[PDB]
Structure formats: structure tokens, C-alpha cells
Amino acid sequence: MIKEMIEDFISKGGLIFTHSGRYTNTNNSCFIFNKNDIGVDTKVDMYTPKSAGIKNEEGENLWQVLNKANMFYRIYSGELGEELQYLLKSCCTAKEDVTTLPQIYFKNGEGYDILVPIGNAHNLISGTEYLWEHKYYNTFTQKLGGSNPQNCTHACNKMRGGFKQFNCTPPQVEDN
Amino acid sequence: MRKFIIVKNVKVDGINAKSSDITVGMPPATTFCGLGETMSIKTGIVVKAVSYGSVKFEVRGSRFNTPKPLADGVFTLCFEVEWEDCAEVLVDKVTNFINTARIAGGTIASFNKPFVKVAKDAEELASVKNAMMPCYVVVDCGVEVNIFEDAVNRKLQPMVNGYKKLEKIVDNKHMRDKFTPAYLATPTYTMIGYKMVSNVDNFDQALWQYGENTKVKTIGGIYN
Numbered sequence: 001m002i003k004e005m006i007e008d009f010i011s012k013g014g015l016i017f018t019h020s021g022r023y024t025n026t027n028n029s030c031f032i033f034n035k036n037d038i039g040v041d042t043k044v045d046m047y048t049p050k051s052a053g054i055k056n057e058e059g060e061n062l063w064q065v066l067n068k069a070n071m072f073y074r075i076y077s078g079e080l081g082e083e084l085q086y087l088l089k090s091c092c093t094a095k096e097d098v099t100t101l102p103q104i105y106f107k108n109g110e111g112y113d114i115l116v117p118i119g120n121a122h123n124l125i126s127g128t129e130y131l132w133e134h135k136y137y138n139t140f141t142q143k144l145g146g147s148n149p150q151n152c153t154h155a156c157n158k159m160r161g162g163f164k165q166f167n168c169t170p171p172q173v174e175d176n
Numbered sequence: 177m178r179k180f181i182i183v184k185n186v187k188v189d190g191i192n193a194k195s196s197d198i199t200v201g202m203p204p205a206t207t208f209c210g211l212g213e214t215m216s217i218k219t220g221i222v223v224k225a226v227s228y229g230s231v232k233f234e235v236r237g238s239r240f241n242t243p244k245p246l247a248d249g250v251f252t253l254c255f256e257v258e259w260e261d262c263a264e265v266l267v268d269k270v271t272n273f274i275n276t277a278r279i280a281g282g283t284i285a286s287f288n289k290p291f292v293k294v295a296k297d298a299e300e301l302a303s304v305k306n307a308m309m310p311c312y313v314v315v316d317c318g319v320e321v322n323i324f325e326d327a328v329n330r331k332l333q334p335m336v337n338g339y340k341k342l343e344k345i346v347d348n349k350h351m352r353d354k355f356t357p358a359y360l361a362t363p364t365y366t367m368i369g370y371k372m373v374s375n376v377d378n379f380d381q382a383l384w385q386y387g388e389n390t391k392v393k394t395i396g397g398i399y400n
Contacts, residue, residue, distance in 0.1 A: 096345065108390070113358070113359060113390070114351065116360050117361055123197065130324050142200075165199060166199050167201055168199050168334070169201040169234075169238070170202045171230065172231070173230075
């Protein structure tokens with residue numbers, strides 16, 4: 001069944017990534033898949049036009065399936081056979097887009113590098129989940145997708161409740 | 177001799193509180209290091225490190241009700257510099273830079289007159305350190321496992337400490353600088369703690385600067 005879902009994912013836009021600037025700006029569409037980051041509990045993000053996705057018996061799409069019970073890593077490592085591994089891995093391609101994204105100078109050895117910052121899918125998805133499970137509330141909540149979460153990102157599309165951010169407020173000197 | 181120029185009560189308005197996708201609040205050490213670097217660039221003053229302290233800070237909407245997380249605050253800055261001229265010229269230069277500078281997008285509206293403090297040894301460094309009072313400075317506490325589990329278990333605060341390079345940008349079409357090495361990158365983090373500068377034992381552990389592997393660090397390492 002997940003074979004059908006993956007093939008349907010491929011038939012459409014179908015891009016699996018672990019880093020994207022689309023978390024910063026809605027119209028960005030830069031996607032990166034960092035192979036070093038892939039572990040057993042790695043959360044992964046996905047894009048297709050309008051988050052169009054075939055749904056299973058319980059009404060879940062491919063993104064919901066892959067990020068449940070280490071399914072992504074299990075397919076990626078070949079536990080479910082070489083075919084599924086191949087089909088899934090074909091969608092892990094990078095797309096370069098620097099538009100609307102910051103370009104900063106970070107000092108290197110007597111020189112500089114230009115950095116174009118993009119966000120991490122794992123930190124958002126797994127981070128929100130984790131801070132939820134451990135009742136951490138020293139936090140803000142931000143919603144990603146703008147007016148159209150559906151066309152932003154699968155994680156953005158499903159997680160309409162927003163993502164958790166660490167409240168990095170410092171202590172203050174008192175008046176009196 | 178180690179020379180420091182201190183600027184008290186820097187009132188900043190309209191700070192971009194969002195430093196990363198999962199951090200909102202106090203601008204990270206990268207921003208203040210960046211500020212020191214910019215001052216050295218446009219002033220010619222050699223800046224070795226920077227210590228920065230929170231006097232006031234408030235994210236808009238977090239204390240009372242009224243897009244891009246915006247905040248306002250009052251900081252105290254301390255730049256370690258190398259300067260072999262009279263203090264007055266230095267002070268004037270720093271004043272003229274700070275007057276038009278920006279911290280994480282936030283406008284500087286007001287600040288005390290910059291003054292110079294000198295240290296012959298580690299013991300005068302205490303006088304230097306206490307010239308900053310009152311303010312809460314940032315000290316590096318490092319990561320034990322990862323930022324989430326550290327935030328829950330160690331009850332500390334995550335901060336951007338640099339970046340990890342993901343890929344080299346191959347086509348420089350929309351890159352404003354087509355010569356400097358450009359990379360797609362993502363934020364790296366450490367865990368930090370706040371301390372009243374007077375209670376910080378070794379000042380070098382609150383003096384931030386650039387370092388290897390696209391990171392910022394303190395001169396004296398992890399806090400004790």
C-alpha cells in the first residue's frame with residue numbers, strides 16, 4: 001500500500017527534504033536532503049503541489065506514514081526491500097533557490113563566507129513533538145505556511161497547531 | 177594591557193526576536209559578534225571580543241496584548257579592542273558608529289557615553305567587569321546531548337552559536353557578492369546561561385568572538 005503512496009508521490013511534484021528555506025518564506029522552494037542527518041528517529045519533510053496526496057485506510061497521507069514509528073528510516077535503510085528503498089530515495093533530491101532568503105557574512109580565517117540560512121525539518125517536527133511529550137512550556141508557538149499552509153509544506157499542512165519555539169528571553173535588572 | 181570600551185544602557189527598538197526557526201528572544205552571540213566585526217570594519221578599530229549584557233528586554237505581546245517576533249530592550253556592551261592612541265578619539269569613533277548601528281534589525285535610540293577601561297592583569301579585569309553593572313551577561317554552558325533534552329533536563333536556554341554548511345551555492349545569479357564563498361547553511365546551537373556580570377568569576381568566559389567551524393565562542397571556554 002505504501003508502494004502505491006510513494007508511486008503517487010513520484011507521479012506528482014514529490015520532493016523529500018530535511019532542510020528548506022520555505023520555513024522562512026512561503027515562495028522560496030529551496031530544498032536540501034542532508035544524508036548525514038538520517039538516523040532511526042529522524043523526522044523528514046515533503047512537498048508536492050497543494051500537498052496533494054493519496055490517503056490510506058485510516059486517512060493518512062505519505063508524510064504522516066513516513067514520520068510514524070521510524071517508517072522513513074526503515075524504508076531508507078532497506079528493511080522493507082530494495083524496491084521501496086529505491087523509490088523513496090529517488091525523491092530525496094536537492095533544489096537550489098536563494099531568493100527571498102538572507103545572505104549574511106560570517107567571518108572565516110582572515111576572510112568571510114556568505115551564508116544563506118535555511119531551516120531544519122527535524123527540529124520543527126520532532127522538536128515540537130518532543131517538547132509536547134515532555135510538557136515543556138517555556139515556549140512560543142509560530143504557524144508556518146502563511147495564508148496557504150496547504151501549498152507550503154506537508155508538515156505545515158498537517159501541523160496547523162503550529163510549531164514550538166524556545167522562549168529565549170533573558171532576565172532583567174529591576175527598577176527598584 | 178587589555179583595553180575595553182564600554183557602552184552602558186543601549187536602548188534598542190524593533191529587534192527581530194526570531195534568531196532561528198526554534199529560537200525567539202535575546203539576539204544570539206552571533207549578532208553581537210557581528211556588530212563588533214562591523215564596527216572594526218567601518219571604523220578600523222581592532223575588535224578582539226565582545227561581552228554583552230541584558231538590562232531590559234521584552235518581546236512584544238508577551239507581557240501584555242495589543243507576524244515577525246519583534247522585541248525592545250536595553251543592553252550594555254563591552255568591546256575588547258587594541259588601541260594605541262588617546263581614549264577620547266576612540267570614544268568618539270565608537271559613539272559615531274553606535275549612533276547609526278543596528279542590533280538584529282533594531283534601531284538604537286539612546287545610549288550612555290562610551291568610556292574606556294584598562295586591565296594590567298586578571299585582577300583589574302574585575303574592575304573592568306564590574307564597570308558593566310548592572311546587567312545579565314551570556315555564558316556558554318555547552319551541549320550535553322542535544323538542545324531539546326538539555327533544555328528539559330538541564331533547564332538551560334538554547335542560542336545560535338554559528339552555522340553548518342549544507343551545500344556550496346553553484347550559480348550566483350541572485351547572489352549580491354559573486355566572489356565570496358557562498359553556502360546554503362543551517363543554524364547550530366549551544367546551551368547558554370545568564371549571570372550578573374559581577375558574579376562571573378572569569379570575564380574571559382563572557383567575552384565572545386569568532387572561531388573555527390563557523391562558530392562563535394567565549395575566550396575562556398565553557399563556564400565554571
